[PDB]
């Protein structure tokens, strides 16, 4: 909520599309990520108190999932490469500066 910077979209359906299932997403996780934190977990998503133990079972889930990219993808189905500029705005040295006059 305190991030100062970017969110920027563009269609990579013109490029990233194939069949590319390497593209992936976290469909479910048990909390929100901390500021700028990532969740790398390939761990089993555990729905019941029955431990899955690294195999599939009743409501045994791998939480991360993939987007099948269908080269007929439309505006709702197109991937958007998206970028976000982290910065604190002020209170630290100029790293990215402005083009000074």
């Amino acid at each position: 909520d305190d991030f100062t910077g970017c969110v920027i979209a563009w269609n990579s359906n013109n490029l990233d599309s194939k069949g590319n299932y390497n593209y992936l997403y976290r469909l479910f996780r048990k909390s929100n990520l901390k500021p700028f934190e990532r969740d790398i977990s390939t761990e089993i998503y555990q729905a019941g108190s029955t431990p899955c133990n690294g195999v599939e079972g009743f409501n045994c889930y791998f939480p991360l999932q993939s987007y099948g990219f269908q080269p007929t993808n439309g505006v709702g189905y197109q991937p958007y490469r998206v970028v976000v500029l982290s910065f604190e705005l002020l209170h630290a040295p100029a790293t990215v500066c402005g083009p000074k006059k």
Partner: antibody, heavy 119, light 106 residues
Framework: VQLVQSGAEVKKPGATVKISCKVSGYSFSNYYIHWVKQAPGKSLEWIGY????????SDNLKFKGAATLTADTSTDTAYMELSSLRSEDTAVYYCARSEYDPYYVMDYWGQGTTVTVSS | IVLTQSPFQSVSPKEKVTITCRASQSISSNLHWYQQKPDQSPKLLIKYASQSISGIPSRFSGSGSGTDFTLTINSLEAEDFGIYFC?????????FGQGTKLEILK
């Protein structure tokens, strides 16, 4: 369904105009607002989009008024502050209801705000 | 990432007119058509380049092929014609058509 703008603003060039887009008839927080400029007898020109929940003000770079789109969530009113006014900024400024998801439709708008920037 | 329209089209009632929206380089399969009456807020005719917002005449259609997006009107009425706009989708600035004033003769 209802977007009502502050009336015409006549300034000297270099001065500042801020224009109110007052939402009613729908949910403000569920819709971005597009801000659309029509120079008199000229085409539709889109200065930026704003977010109700955030400072979601993108700016087109064709002209530059040091513009910032502020949305007042209590009154559901997005402002467009257009500074560094120029005689060409003279135009009818529409605000346009935008989707909140990344789909961009402006179905319904303000009534337009003429600004005459001149000495 | 800028789009091109024909400045003017003159047609007769019942005749079919097609106004093009021609975007440079890549195009986005969404587009938005607007009928601006003189001195009046343009109104969105065509959404996604394939659909009408509700209440808009069935003679108002839209499309795209290659880099062009058409504003296609079938069977005009002398009430219908007006200034027409297309709006680029995505690619940063929604770059609105230069506008097309439609005339209907007869």
């Amino acid at each position: 369904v209802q977007l009502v703008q502050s009336g015409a603003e006549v300034k000297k060039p270099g001065a500042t105009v801020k224009i109110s887009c007052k939402v009613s008839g729908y949910s403000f927080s569920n819709y971005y607002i597009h801000w659309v400029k029509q120079a008199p007898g000229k085409s539709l020109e889109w200065i930026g989009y704003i977010d109700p929940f955030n400072g979601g003000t993108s700016d087109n770079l064709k002209f530059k008024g040091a513009a910032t789109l502020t949305a007042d969530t209590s009154t559901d009113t997005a402002y467009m502050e257009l500074s560094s006014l120029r005689s060409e900024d003279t135009a009818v400024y529409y605000c346009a209801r935008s989707e909140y998801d990344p789909y961009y439709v402006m179905d319904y708008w303000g009534q337009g705000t003429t600004v005459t920037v001149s000495s | 990432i800028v789009l091109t329209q024909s400045p003017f089209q003159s047609v007769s009632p019942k005749e079919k007119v097609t106004i093009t929206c021609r975007a440079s380089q890549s195009i986005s399969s969404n587009l938005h058509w607007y009928q601006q009456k003189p001195d009046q807020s343009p109104k969105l005719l065509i959404k996604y380049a394939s659909q009408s917002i509700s209440g808009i005449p069935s003679r108002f259609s839209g499309s795209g092929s290659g880099t062009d997006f058409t504003l296609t009107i079938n069977s005009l009425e002398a009430e219908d014609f007006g200034i027409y706009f297309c709006q680029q989708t995505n690619f940063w600035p929604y770059i609105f058509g230069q506008g097309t004033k439609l005339e209907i003769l007869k």
